[PDB]
Amino acid sequence: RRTLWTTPDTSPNCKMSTEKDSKLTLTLTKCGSQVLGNVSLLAVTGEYHQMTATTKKDVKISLLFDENGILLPSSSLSKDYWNYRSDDSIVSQKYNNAVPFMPNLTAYPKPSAQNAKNYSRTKIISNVYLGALTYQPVIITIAFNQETENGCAYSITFTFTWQKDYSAQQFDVTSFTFSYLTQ
Amino acid sequence: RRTLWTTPDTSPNCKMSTEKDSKLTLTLTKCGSQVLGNVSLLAVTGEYHQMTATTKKDVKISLLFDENGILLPSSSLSKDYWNYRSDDSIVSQKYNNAVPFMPNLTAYPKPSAQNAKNYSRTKIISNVYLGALTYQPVIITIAFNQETENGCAYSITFTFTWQKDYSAQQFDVTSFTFSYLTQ
Amino acid sequence: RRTLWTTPDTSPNCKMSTEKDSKLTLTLTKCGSQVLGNVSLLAVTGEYHQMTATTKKDVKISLLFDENGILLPSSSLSKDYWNYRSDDSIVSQKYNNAVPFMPNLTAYPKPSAQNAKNYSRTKIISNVYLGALTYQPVIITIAFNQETENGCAYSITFTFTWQKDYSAQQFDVTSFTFSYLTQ
Ligand SMILES: N[C@@H](CCC(=O)O)C(=O)O
Ligand SMILES: N[C@@H](CCC(=O)O)C(=O)O
Ligand SMILES: N[C@@H](CCC(=O)O)C(=O)O
């Protein structure tokens, strides 16, 4: 099976501010030596559902994986909601190896004492758009294997950062396509 | 067969202003649960071939599909010009099911009375560049399943929108890569 | 075999200013009628390793290919460092046909006397980010089949161009994903 995903529904699965306040829509499709990824994020409740002038314009969604490529429970994304695809849902077996979906550790090494700043290639940076409004850019930073916490073997994080005042709006962004080299 | 396309030639196939004034180059390659898409647009004749100060800085190219995934004749793209790949041309059979290329209706639901504003994930927004000149951004908005007209089951639309004055120039943009979840 | 790459290590393989001053990380994965590509560039030594106020804010990395799809020795990328994937390295056979990885000559024709300016679809233009810092955009231009020198049959070039003063910094950019139609 060649896709890992959250499912495409809008049932909350993720933490932006508080637990299960948001829907991360994420699909990872294996394409040989790369995964083709597609991501977006919606705030369903809580502060990011109706932002204020003081809301933090920087949200990080962390997916931490063990050595089998299985999501760790300390991730921002709930495990209930994350598995191999089956129709528009997921497979019933909870604990399925997924090393071939993990980001390559040579391309994207964990940070170390060896070399201070890590390679910029460990990140993808671009813009997505809040509310699908062209005048409302939000910077998406995708980082590969740059987390060490909770004993993780691999990581994929999605950070959204912006400068303009989006108060009174619901955080919701356009979809973003990306790829990365696999283990 | 795993690619639907316009063919890569420059024979006009599309309407920007008037019928068959432009070449839409579009390739959809099936990659499991995603299509990998690649698009660009060129004006061959008519107003967008030599824009004026009053030309509309907003062009929408609509591909409408029936429940079989087959292009409807009311689309901006001519059907003559759109089919499964065979060499650098298309297959001879005109009417081939293509549901596995269609955008997923759970990820990208049609608009309804149920929920006012639709999910931003139904769109991709980025920049492409007019004339391949780095100082001439044009915003591309790709939208999935957001059309209802003509009884369509699915839709993919490409809107190009800009602010700067590109008068006297030919509309022609750099290629854009994207993906989406499939039915 | 469905991936051509540089390998994901940081051993210098490329010329920005002087020979083997930099690491081009490039992976081309065949996906039917498209290649899914992923690129980034790091300066390891020389001027781009510690830029000055006079360093040229325009670097072109040229991959030139023969009619078999094999890299020509006059390319910016060293051939030693470029082959079909095998684990995290490359296959031992040096000279492997790769026409199915080459950019389509109908979609991306070489430049000619026939039609002055070439089609903008021959290029992809976007931003990547120096040092993975969101305030440091660098424009990446990918061009397909636009070189004629050294008798090349095909070409893929990566040009990085910028305006801001990045003096004292090491040239290093975030990863960029793209696709193109294949021969
Ligand atoms: N890196 C994979 C093998 C290559 C791949 O599946 O992409 C593994 O370590 O299991
Ligand atoms: N959604 C497809 C099945 C899954 C796929 O082909 O991507 C169908 O409805 O026919
Ligand atoms: N263009 C290929 C055939 C199609 C493909 O492999 O993508 C060739 O000329 O050998």
Residue numbers in the entry:
A (entry chain A), B (entry chain A), C (entry chain A): 186 to 368
How do the authors describe this structure?
Ile324, which is seen to be involved in hydrophobic interactions with the N-acetyl methyl group, can also have multiple conformations. We suggest that the long arm of Ile324 adopts the sialic acid–binding conformation in response to the hydrophobic pressure exerted by sialic acid entering the pocket, minimizing the exposed hydrophobic surface when unbound, holding the methyl group between the short arm of Ile310 and the Tyr312 ring, making this an example of induced fit. We suggest that Gln348 may be labile until the binding of sialic acid.
Adenoviruses are clinically important, both as human pathogens and as platforms for therapeutic applications. Species D adenovirus type 26 (HAdV-D26) is both a cause of EKC and other diseases and a promising vaccine vector. Here, we demonstrate that HAdV-D26 uses sialic acid–bearing glycans as a primary entry receptor and that this interaction can form a productive infection. We solve the structure of HAdV-D26K in complex with sialic acid [N-acetylneuraminic acid (Neu5Ac)], revealing a similar topology to the known sialic acid–interacting HAdV-D37 fiber knob in the sialic acid–binding pocket, but highlight crucial mechanistic differences likely to enhance HAdV-D26 affinity for sialic acid compared to other types.
